[PDB]
């Protein structure tokens, strides 16, 4: 099976990639293309050709649960064996990972991008007619939540179909024609320029992983509705809005007190503020500004108000959430007394001892104390 390569893009999905390959070879659809490549895959004695599907809505290597290894071996075989010149096929993979965010949402790698898993769309996806007729492709960005339309022309879509059903770019194809009418179909521009490298907003330049960690962390913790002036309001008043709401939360948790003064629990004070910052996903502190702000707000006020923040009652649980270790490693470090124990769910430590232990021993290559000092 010899094929004809399409032009490689950096804003490309995989479904549209197979639609490109099917519609320059001469296939009327992609179902017959997928039948033909499965016949070619059993033609070459591959040990996993049984699970390679016939439908296009779950071609991706995260949809399968049992043969993702055979999935990516099939993608290596289609990359190295069946094109006249191999296009950018392996880089457009859409996978799962080892990595995971905080508190309980796991992560996925698309090229180099690291997204979470829960807010990944599993439903029908809209698109724009101008990037589908003038360009022709269909970007991978259309099924990430918080994105509506394109980079330049900036028109409002027809997202839902115009009778009550739902138009999809992978059901009827990339021809933009529905099956009832037979015709082809400023903070919004800020998120579309945000996703264009045209960064015109006081939220500065940013890498991808910590970007998506913060956006998904806000949309998962705060549980708000959808508006573009809303997320220009959250991120164009730094550092006023987040400092104001954490002062409101610390007044709310210091006014309402169920536990005693000697038994102040950390989670009952900062459960909605302290958890989801550290493993989002990794140990970078350049543009991961939430750890810089939180660690500075903890650093300038250790023993303020007769030692209130440094002396907190801990059940020795969240340490294994945040020290990047396991419980057996905790037991092996306690039995050699590297820190004073003044069981897993029993109270043994305080916040200041774990804080000094992080400042002393468990610093990684970048995640340390001296990369956020001049940011106040």
């Amino acid at each position: 099976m010899f094929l004809q390569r399409p032009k490689p893009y950096s804003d490309e999905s995989l479904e549209s990639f197979f639609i490109r390959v099917a519609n320059k070879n001469g296939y009327g659809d992609v179902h017959r293309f997928l039948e033909a490549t499965k016949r070619f895959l059993q033609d070459i004695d591959h040990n996993g050709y049984q699970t390679f599907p016939t439908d296009i809505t779950r071609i991706n290597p995260y949809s399968a649960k049992n043969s993702s290894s055979a999935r990516t071996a099939s993608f290596l075989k289609l990359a190295q064996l069946t094109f006249n010149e191999p296009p950018e096929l392996l880089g457009l993979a859409i996978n799962r990972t080892n990595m995971k965010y905080s508190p309980s949402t796991s992560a996925v790698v698309r090229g180099a991008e690291v997204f979470p898993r829960s807010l990944l769309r599993t439903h029908s996806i809209p698109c724009c007619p101008l990037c589908l007729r003038e360009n022709g492709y269909a970007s991978y960005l259309w099924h990430f939540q918080g994105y509506e339309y394109c980079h330049s022309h900036n028109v409002p879509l027809i997202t839902t179909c115009s009778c009550g059903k739902e138009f999809d770019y992978r059901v009827s194809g990339l021809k933009g024609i529905c099956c009832k009418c037979k015709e082809p179909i400023e903070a919004a521009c800020t998120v579309s320029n945000w996703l264009a490298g045209h960064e015109s907003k006081p939220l500065p330049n940013l890498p991808k992983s910590y970007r998506w960690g913060l956006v998904h962390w806000w949309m998962g913790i705060k549980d708000s509705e959808f508006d573009h002036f809303s997320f220009v309001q959250f991120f164009s008043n730094w550092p006023r809005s987040f400092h104001s709401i954490i002062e409101d939360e610390v007044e709310f948790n210091l006014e309402h007190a169920v536990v005693s003064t000697s038994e102040l629990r950390l989670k009952d004070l900062l459960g909605r503020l302290f958890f989801g910052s550290i493993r989002l996903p990794e140990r970078n502190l350049q543009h991961n500004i939430i750890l810089g702000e939180l660690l500075c707000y903890l650093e300038n006020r250790l023993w303020q108000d007769k030692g209130l923040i440094a002396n907190l009652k801990m059940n020795a649980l969240e340490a294994t959430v945040m020290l990047n270790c396991s419980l057996d490693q905790i037991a092996s470090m306690v039995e050699q007394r590297i820190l004073k124990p003044n069981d897993v769910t029993d109270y043994l430590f305080h916040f200041g001892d774990i804080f000094c232990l992080w400042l002393a021993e468990f610093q990684s290559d970048e995640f340390n104390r001296s990369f956020y000092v001049s940011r106040w």
């Binding site: 179902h31 016949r39 699970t51 599907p53 016939t54 399968a64 649960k65 049992n66 043969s67």
Partner: protein, 309 residues
């Protein structure tokens, strides 16, 4: 729920396949193999079976017959479960008809699924059906690699609605019966090998029968019926079909899907049949965990077997 006695009898029952060799002098002779006895110095057979030199093609033949034995249990201890089961099958054929299971079995007959690893390294194979009761000349399916690939492609044949309708009358009508004779022509390359069935020993000894003095390999009676029942594609997060057992067993990669922790085995589904006659007497039925469990239950009564404690 699950009395002392409960047992069903099977609806589909196939027979042995027989392999023959056709010559350019326009005849056909049985296929024979050979052992070689491995001796030591001064025991285990090893059987080999290859296509003879100067032949033309292999012809395989068997016969399958569909019946109506699923509509009532062969045994039942109590007149409380049998009422539930007979109206379960009656509401299933009233609401959501017999055409999905019938097409999904007749596809596995018509493409050569029962040629287990014998169509790897093969040029073209052609399947001919002779149905009964029938009026006309035989039902041909030609060159299944490059002419028949999907369910829409079978339906564009002349003799397909009649075949699926006589299977539907067999599964529906009490005291009803359909009988197909199948023979398939394989054009294998020169000195290609043949893979028949193997006897259970705890190497590589073949299952054989005597055809007019010559021994021949067969490829099974129970094996070839485990290839018409590879239709299980309804388990949670499905990708690849299965033999319709009760515990979703995928053979080679040892693990079993549909473990009773997930609740998608036959007994956890069977013990909730009053919910299925609950839902199928309404006016809309969801195709995600209610149609996909009635399909599994009806495919798992056609298999048969005793459902006891």
């Amino acid at each position: 729920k699950l009395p002392t006695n409960l047992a069903y009898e099977r609806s589909i029952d196939p027979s042995d396949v027989c392999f023959f060799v056709v010559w350019p002098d326009d005849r056909k002779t049985p296929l024979t193999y050979n052992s070689r006895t491995l001796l030591g110095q001064m025991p285990h057979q090893v059987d080999f079976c290859h296509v003879p030199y100067g032949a033309s093609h292999i012809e395989c033949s068997f016969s399958v017959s569909f019946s109506s034995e699923l509509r009532q249990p062969y045994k039942c201890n109590s007149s409380k479960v049998k009422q539930t089961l007979v109206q379960l099958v009656e509401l299933y054929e009233t609401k959501i008809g017999w055409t999905e299971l019938a097409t999904r079995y007749l596809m596995n007959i018509c493409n050569g699924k029962w040629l287990w690893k014998n169509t790897r390294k093969a040029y073209c194979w052609n399947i001919v059906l002779t149905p009964w009761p029938w009026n006309g000349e035989k039902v041909g399916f030609e060159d299944i690699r490059t002419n028949y690939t999907s369910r829409q492609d079978f339906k564009n044949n002349k003799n397909w609605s009649a075949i699926v309708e006589m299977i539907k009358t067999a599964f529906s009508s009490t005291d009803g019966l359909a009988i197909f004779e199948v023979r398939a022509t394989l054009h294998l390359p020169t000195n290609a090998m043949v893979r028949p069935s193997q006897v259970f020993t705890e190497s590589r000894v073949f299952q054989s029968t005597t055809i007019d003095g010559e021994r021949s390999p067969i490829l099974g009676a129970f094996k070839t019926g485990a290839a018409i029942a590879t239709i299980d594609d309804w388990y949670p997060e499905a990708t690849e079909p299965l033999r319709v057992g009760r515990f979703g067993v995928h053979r080679e990669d040892v693990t079993c899907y549909r473990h009773p922790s997930t609740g998608k085995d036959f007994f956890s589904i069977l013990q909730q049949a009053e919910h299925y006659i609950e839902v199928l007497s309404a006016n809309k039925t969801p195709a995600q965990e209610t149609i996909n469990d009635m399909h599994f239950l009806m495919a798992n009564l056609i298999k048969g077997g005793m459902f006891q404690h």
